[PDB]
Symmetry: C4
Subunit: 388 residues, 4 copies
């Protein structure tokens, strides 16, 4: 009926309250559950959903064998209610996709699903499930996108795509989409920067995206922009380094930190003035553990000092991708934009002795009331019957 | 649209008509059914639902192994339609929780889910699925709540939480909640009393809660209160003792009956003037059997005499927790508050030779027409394939 | 919103067009499907549903073992959409019941579920899922009802219950129900008659019920009545005998035909003037085959001549119970009452080498356009894995 | 509420964007998924659905054995949401059918399901699930229909049925249906032509159907007609031959091309002026591969030259039936009729070493933006556990 306004500011928060846990892998030991990756949450004005990519194989079946291309023609974007195990019996089909994003403008769902060959992949955009536009690769080298929700403000939704090497300079574009039609795009002028798998959120009528530098940055890049795609770029300055892998905390940089800068993990962070909430793994080397850190000057200053840490997953347990999501005033009844996040808990290959790899999910919302750290890990006992 | 009024009196009844039976365990021998505990029913102005806690494991799977903490990070509050087996394919996610309560104010669902560590657990309150408040532990010793429905009157919902020892004096609070926000709380001044797992129901614009004394009472404690949290406390006086374990019926007390007073089972009872409907197990020592007893003076007098008994489950079959639920006039069309109850039929450990423990459920509503006693037990044949 | 009027006459028809087939047993060889009996169809002003009784066990599981009481505390009335396999994942819970009826008045569903002991069983009546009344046994000898839909006319719904011997004279009552409350009942004065498992349908503001004589009739008894429960009784006169078992067709009677009169099968027939559509098995001795016969004088004349036969199930395949259902003008848009019927295809014990017994279903609607006979049998290949 | 107008022209397009992929077979290796054929898509003004025929057997079960009649009494038309694996837990029942069509007029669904014996089969027509008419065989030799969607224009829906030999001259009729009632039919005068399994679509208030000649044509026949059933017939003229099997491309004919003309595969094509979009297999001999070809003069000229080819499935992978579907302006918001297509990917017998045969599906919509060819095959690894 009416577009989400997108004009409120992020809510003042003090900590993170647990929102969901699906136990998808534990349930999938016996039930009929998809093998999934990137279980990103996104919400409308009425409800929240978990989106995910599947190869159309179930846990404990031979088709879950992971020695197959990530970018396969079987890969599909699907969604199910938040907190449920992702099954063929409760999941909706969204798009054929090996890279994706989705977001709700207040009226209907936009989904973006990229499929096709590496040298010519096409993003199919859908609005309320009907194809409304396509974007084809402009460098012929793996067109790819956020793997989390796009950001909507007053009926325009915004996303970021990358095309080019994942181990060197690439090309980055921002897209403005209305009723699933591309109305504007801009190519970033970002020499020496690298953007992948952006987590973008609206805040006071502009978008902020925090991304992954897979080339040569162990801190995270960011790009922010207004409704006309006039943008700014930088890297998060804090010495509390956000990517995985990374060095031990040390002197930061408002450009890419080259030490342990290659590879990465999808991640997010929330800017509050000169301060920043960072979610990151607990290990510097593997996707293990998860913590939220408040660094009151960490957006702009390069020291390694921070003031608050909240435990989310212990370093003895596997974590994985994570991303932002918001809950607008039209859903919550609040006067401010609520920040939330999800974490993927990756099980299986390469770290564990299975034929498959899947994630389960947890999610949290920021609140200004009492909270507590704990560890909420995946909890499945591997290997499974199919691995014997 | 409009809040439940909560101002009517309990319906005059003569007996208990059977309302539901889910056969969850029998079905879960082959189907994909959660291992559950505390299958409490609660209703809105339109429908009733069964809420429950799961560890996110299914029957007949290795993850159902019960030599694990009750208070785990895997534990979740879920709900499904009354009378259906609780499966990942028909259950909705509500909250991450190892102790919970839920209730509908006429407008939306309030859910309360407690997770986190023993020394600092946090109740996450949700209204229509959106986080609206948190309550953190105030004694740092296992914040916990009803495991049945909270009580709503004219848009305010009420619950009771405990924090402190389960084998000695603890601390008890009543909470008043509006649109999922705590608007008032009071700490009971109840020396020598013990409250756990309260069953609370509205009756004539006030709430009555009947609970479990785990310290030193084989009769049940109660607390009643008005909308401003001005309260009264006591224990049910009847010599028809309500808890399990308990002594043989004898002289009662309007304080805790110390004989066989340690441990307990979640239970309920309904006050009608000086009279009381008690639901209890049939065994004095184990959670076996279930019966409803009408004691016309049993709220206030300490004799062991009663006038009506209705069989629910035979003493040769396992029972478990039980709790109250009501059905308001906005749902039923009646001019009075309808009392109902559920019973959990616990199967597996510690009494039986399985690796797991789960409950199925039955429920009954009070009526003023003809009724009959019978035994409606769980009916599964144990052990299961996973226990071999 | 508005009650079904129930004042139209049965549609003129010439034959029977196939309406549904669920293939429940074939699907249940692998899927998670209830063991069921009496899959009766009933419709509202918007949709049709299949109701059924289950013991809360699934096909191919140990709990499906049939050497158990029919009248057990596990037995439940459930419903699912017409034409779907009856699973815990698509079925709704209605009532705890070992004998049942249901019907929709235009506004909400009435369900009637009988449970409890043989010497004191209680029918629980629900309207829109809320308990609205109870009827207790009046002879203390197996209170039981239709196992098919009740009949509704202008907001009053009507049913027939029996209490007493199934091998001798019993007691028969008609009940008039409004918003799930009994407003009137009458006991039939029917010496030497026997009524069980009535199929009742509305026609021109009155109800006609065709039933099973289990005592001493191989033709079917009937009772018809107006809104004030003023009734008439008889037996279908045709020599085309309707029950199973029965003798070969011969001279009929407008009283019970004693030859092969003991035992029976639930069945139906539709009166059109002095003429009758009879559905019956093809075998005189076992529940095998199914056919529809039009006998233009068969309501009132005792000859064995008929004019039309339409094959439904071949005599080489198992049939079972069958019952009427109607589709009112408020659902169909027609100016007349549409007659339909379902058939249960019974598989397993006692005729086949399994531990279990279940039915699948087929259904047909009367039409005045071209039709064709065929055989639409169950089609499962027995025995199943659990029987090995 | 309001009928689809059906008066717009096909959208100008340049290529085909991927719309769905269900991975039904891969998922059905472990989950509970029907064995299916003819997964045709059809849409309303609100949503799209996949319709299909099942024998009521699941993958990996003994009942999936394919040495059984295609025209069995077990065969049923069912439907599920586009892009989901077709399971008993997410599929709706539509009709008992071994040949079918369905379409939505803007108000409700029409379904047409043919069952019964070869010498007298009856199409049961339903509108909003209620039987509204029947059509019986007029040649007593396998009455059969489209196996894809019928075409609706301003409240009248249109379909084509065949009756007679599949290896010689037969009889062909067009039917006009309103609210599920046949209002008009015409028999084609088409000597030497053969029509089976028509794909029909509306375009500018008329219908075009492209079909399969099973007798003696390796090009496809067509019939077009207006709302009064005044018709024209021919064969697609292009030397880019459309059927399977077929000869190598060569000189075409605006009559049947006899070389490799016997047998066939259900297919479609879209007429744009004198030009045509043809979907066909890549192999000339087996149902392998799939491609879309634009031949700018191919409706009317017989040369073998074409200008655009888009890969859909590689020749090393199995394809199967394919059919048209449209998306009207009332669904899309466009000013033109959107052309789409589905393809069935047939796995199992006769080409592969299994006891069963099933299809999965992919679908595509025409767009005027950038697109790309690829191969999106079924992807299951055969044989399955049941075949061992
Ligand atoms: C933030 O925006 C709200 C909502 O703006 C309206 O809805 C949007 C989707 C878009 O359509 C806008 O153009 C609409 O005005 C603002 O609230 C509105 O303010 C206007 C101007 O005073 C007023 O007339 C409306 O009644 C308001 N609507 C509501 C529902 O309150 C709000 O002022 C903006 N806040 C800030 C801080 O920018
Ligand atoms: C019990 O309360 C009912 C309902 O009260 C209304 O709805 C509540 C949720 C709340 O909003 C109240 O403040 C509302 O009045 C009472 O019925 C109402 O009585 C008032 C006063 O006479 C009258 O104006 C309304 O029409 C009534 N509403 C309805 C639907 O009947 C009722 O009187 C109370 N009964 C008792 C015994 O206290
Ligand atoms: C059969 O009954 C219809 C409907 O009657 C109405 O709806 C019923 C549920 C009940 O509420 C009745 O008391 C209602 O009248 C009759 O149609 C109605 O006829 C009346 C009297 O002429 C007229 O005023 C209404 O408009 C009619 N309603 C509709 C929807 O047509 C109809 O006459 C009856 N037919 C026969 C043969 O008895
Ligand atoms: C195509 O048809 C549209 C819609 O026609 C209406 O809806 C149909 C289902 C049917 O009921 C028609 O008889 C209706 O007119 C035409 O648009 C309508 O045009 C009329 C005539 O000018 C106008 O009064 C209406 O407002 C229009 N309705 C809408 C929703 O725009 C349209 O003109 C037709 N287009 C062509 C090219 O034939
Ligand atoms: C897992 O898959 C591996 C290779 O698959 C091989 O590759 C796939 C893509 C197909 O081509 C398959 O037919 C090939 O054999 C195997 O090496 C491995 O054995 C597979 N199975 C396992 C690990 O159990
Ligand atoms: C059931 O679980 C028991 C112990 O689990 C042990 O504890 C759990 C929490 C994990 O740490 C597990 O890896 C440990 O082995 C076992 O003792 C027992 O064998 C388990 N399996 C059974 C009973 O089959
Ligand atoms: C099927 O059930 C039969 C008897 O059950 C016996 O009766 C039931 C009600 C229970 O009391 C059960 O524990 C008893 O053993 C058995 O005789 C029979 O073996 C059962 N199993 C089969 C046929 O596989
Ligand atoms: C598959 O089915 C084949 C024949 O079925 C035979 O035909 C069916 C219709 C039934 O009559 C069945 O009872 C008959 O045996 C068998 O030849 C074949 O063995 C079946 N099983 C397989 C291939 O595993
Ligand atoms: C929001 O978008 C609407 C519709 O395009 C436009 O009229 C309006 O001015 C926008 N509001 C703001 C505050 O930008
Ligand atoms: C019920 O709550 C409303 C809204 O807060 C208040 O105005 C009203 O007086 C309350 N009614 C009663 C009887 O307490
Ligand atoms: C139908 O029932 C209504 C409401 O009780 C009554 O007023 C009306 O007269 C009835 N109509 C007929 C035709 O009996
Ligand atoms: C569409 O059908 C309606 C209702 O039958 C008729 O009045 C109208 O003229 C039709 N419109 C056109 C353009 O044919
Ligand atoms: Ca990096
Ligand atoms: Ca700092
Ligand atoms: Ca105690
Ligand atoms: Ca007493
Ligand atoms: Ca008999
Ligand atoms: Ca006769
Ligand atoms: Ca051909
Ligand atoms: Ca050409």
């Amino acid at each position: 009926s009416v577009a989400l306004a997108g004009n409120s500011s992020l809510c003042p928060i003090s900590g993170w309250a647990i929102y969901s846990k699906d136990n998808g892998i534990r349930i999938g030991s016996k039930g009929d559950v998809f093998v999934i990756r990137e279980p990103f949450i996104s919400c409308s004005h009425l409800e929240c959903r978990t989106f995910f990519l599947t190869q159309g194989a179930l846990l404990n079946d031979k088709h879950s064998n992971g020695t197959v291309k990530d970018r396969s023609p079987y890969r599909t974007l699907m969604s199910c209610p938040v907190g449920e195990a992702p099954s063929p019996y409760n999941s909706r089909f969204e798009s054929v996709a090996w890279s994706a994003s989705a977001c709700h403008d207040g009226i209907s769902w936009l989904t973006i699903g990229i499929s096709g060959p590496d040298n010519g992949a096409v993003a199919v955009l859908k609005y309320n499930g009907i194809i409304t536009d396509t974007i084809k690769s402009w460098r012929s080298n793996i067109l790819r996108t956020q793997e989390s929700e796009c950001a909507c403000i007053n009926g325009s939704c915004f996303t970021i795509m990358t095309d080019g090497p994942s181990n060197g300079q690439a090309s980055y574009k921002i897209f403005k989409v209305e009723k699933g039609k591309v109305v504007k795009s801009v190519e970033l002028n970002a020499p020496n920067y690298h953007y992948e798998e952006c987590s973008c959120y609206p805040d006071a009528s502009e978008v902020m995206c925090v991304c992954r530098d897979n080339w040569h940055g162990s801190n995270r890049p960011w790009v922010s922009f207004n409704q006309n795609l006039e943008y700014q770029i930088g890297y998060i300055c804090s010495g509390v380094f956000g990517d995985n892998p990374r060095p031990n905390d040390g002197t930061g940089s408002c450009g890419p930190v080259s030490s342990n800068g290659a590879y990465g993990v999808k991640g997010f962070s929330f800017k509050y003035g000169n301060g920043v909430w960072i979610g990151r793994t607990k290990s510097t080397s593997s996707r293990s553990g998860f913590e939220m850190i408040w660094d009151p000057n960490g957006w702009t200053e390069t020291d390694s000092s921070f003031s608050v840490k909240q435990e989310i997953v212990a370093i003895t347990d596997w974590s994985g991708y994570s991303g932002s999501f918001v809950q607008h005033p039209e859903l919550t009844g609040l006067d401010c934009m609520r920040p939330c996040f999800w974490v993927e808990l990756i099980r299986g290959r390469p770290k564990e002795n299975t034929i498959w790899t899947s994630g389960s999910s947890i999610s949290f919302c920021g609140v200004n009331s009492d909270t507590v750290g704990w560890s909420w890990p995946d909890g499945a006992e591997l290997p499974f019957t199919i691995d014997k």
